[PDB]
Design a protein around this nucleic acid. Structure first.
Lengths: 247, 93
RNA sequence: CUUAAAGAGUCAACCCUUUGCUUAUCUUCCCUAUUUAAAUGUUAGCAGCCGCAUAGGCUG
DNA sequence: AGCAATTTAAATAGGGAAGATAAGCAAAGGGTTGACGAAAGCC
DNA sequence: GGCTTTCGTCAACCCTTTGCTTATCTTCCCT
């Protein structure tokens, strides 16, 4: 027995489009799983999965180059060079209207759940982008599978993410089978021995290289199983769909 | 006259027990029609205090008092069916 | 606590000019629109004269 | 002061012409966006 | 003894010019 809260038409601008070194565009499912665990921390409603779809999404720039951001002189000790233009590190920006659907388990009324999600989203930040606007979130429940599809079709219109898996690698199949690659998680390289320059000193830290899976965009109504669009934190330091690989 | 209606999806998802569902039955489930004359709707006179009404209320309340010890020994299924019978007899009367 | 955290792309402008889409065409033959039937619904609310009446009565 | 009838059939065919051309210029700019390493005054 | 400023150091490209998908609709039935 499943419960969901849907925030439709989440207009967000200033999204850090740099998903990884080789992916620029839509934020991956690690971003929205991070947003889900962020509310698990601030609001206390513990979130299993998030199904996110893109209503609108434009990467700022041309069709072959992204619009770089005019950097500001914010480091310490480079005064005197501040009159000249700051050097640009690559961070593409994008705008996106999203539709989010969080699997939550809740025991109180739907009004306080909607208010808690609204108070989170008013202080949230989708992929480094300020949430410009969002409709009032609404609670829908998936008692059975037809009710699961009711929740699924309540995200209309949006293009959700379905996992199609890695056959050999990322570049090969992106040309061959023409699917989109995105960060489904990370791979740990080395333990980090210096916790002085970090957010926490006690949380263990690892250098990571983003693993990618290959995904497709399908409209949420054309997705047969809603579990193939709900991304959640898998126990391989990755994220994964509940329904597995989309067929 | 009519049963309360619960619009809440989480409440419809989770509520199972007798009181634990009944605590979710609010005034907004059909009773609260429009709500602009609430203060006149809750200023009340007490002209019921008569002979036969008070003795009937006392004898029935004490009847309930004496029998409610078997009510807690019932199961959920019993409570639901017994209260359905009580509601049916109440609309009948 | 989401490759989290952060960032002003600004400016400027003469698309010019020119032009022959002309030419000739058989639309054409054919043929049954045929047959009915109450306008009823009171189908009219008038003309004088008795009067102060545009109140009320009478006359045919 | 509303009442206005029903069915039945709507043409078969033959044609939609090719021949020509479809300009040549000249432009299309760069100006900022550099981090390590190394002298070298300076607390 | 670092420390913060400014000047010197080290380079060198082969590019390509839209789809990705493509929207949540009536049979029984009796009141």
């Amino acid at each position: 027995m499943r419960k969901f809260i849907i925030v439709k038409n989440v207009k967000v601008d200033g999204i850090n489009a740099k998903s990884s070194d080789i992916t620029v565009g839509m934020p991956p499912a690690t971003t929205f799983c991070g947003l889900g665990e962020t509310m698990s921390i601030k609001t206390g409603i513990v979130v299993k999965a998030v199904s996110y779809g893109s209503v609108k999404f434009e990467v700022r720039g041309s069709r072959f180059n992204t619009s770089v951001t005019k950097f500001a002189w914010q480091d310490r000790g480079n005064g005197g060079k501040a009159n000249n233009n700051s050097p640009i590190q690559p961070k593409p920006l994008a705008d996106g209207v999203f539709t989010l659907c969080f699997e939550v388990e809740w025991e109180d009324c739907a009004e306080v759940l909607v208010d808690k999600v609204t108070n989170f989203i008013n202080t949230a930040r989708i992929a480094g982008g300020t949430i410009a606007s969002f409709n009032k979130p609404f609670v829908k429940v998936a008692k059975d599978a037809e009710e699961l599809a009711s929740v699924k079709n309540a995200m209309m219109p949006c293009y959700v993410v379905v996992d199609c898996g890695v056959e050999v690698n990322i570049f090969e199949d992106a040309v061959n089978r023409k699917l989109q690659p995105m960060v489904n998680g990370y791979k740990k390289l080395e333990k980090i021995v210096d916790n002085k320059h970090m957010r926490d000193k006690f949380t263990p830290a690892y250098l990571a290289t983003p693993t990618y899976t290959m995904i497709g965009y399908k409209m949420v109504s054309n997705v047969d199983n809603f579990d193939q669009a709900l991304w959640q934190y898998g126990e391989n330091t990755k994220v994964k769909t509940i329904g597995g690989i989309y067929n | 006259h009519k049963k309360g209606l619960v619009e809440d999806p989480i409440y419809r998802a989770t509520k199972t027990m007798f009181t634990e569902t009944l605590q979710c039955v609010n005034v907004n489930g059909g009773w609260f029609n429009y709500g602009d004359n609430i203060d006149e709707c809750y200023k009340i006179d007490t002209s019921f205090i008569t002979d036969t009404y008070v003795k009937q209320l006392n004898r029935y309340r004490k009847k309930l008092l004496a029998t409610k010890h078997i009510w807690f020994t019932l199961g959920e299924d019993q409570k639901i069916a017994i209260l359905q019978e009580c509601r049916v007899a109440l609309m009948l009367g």
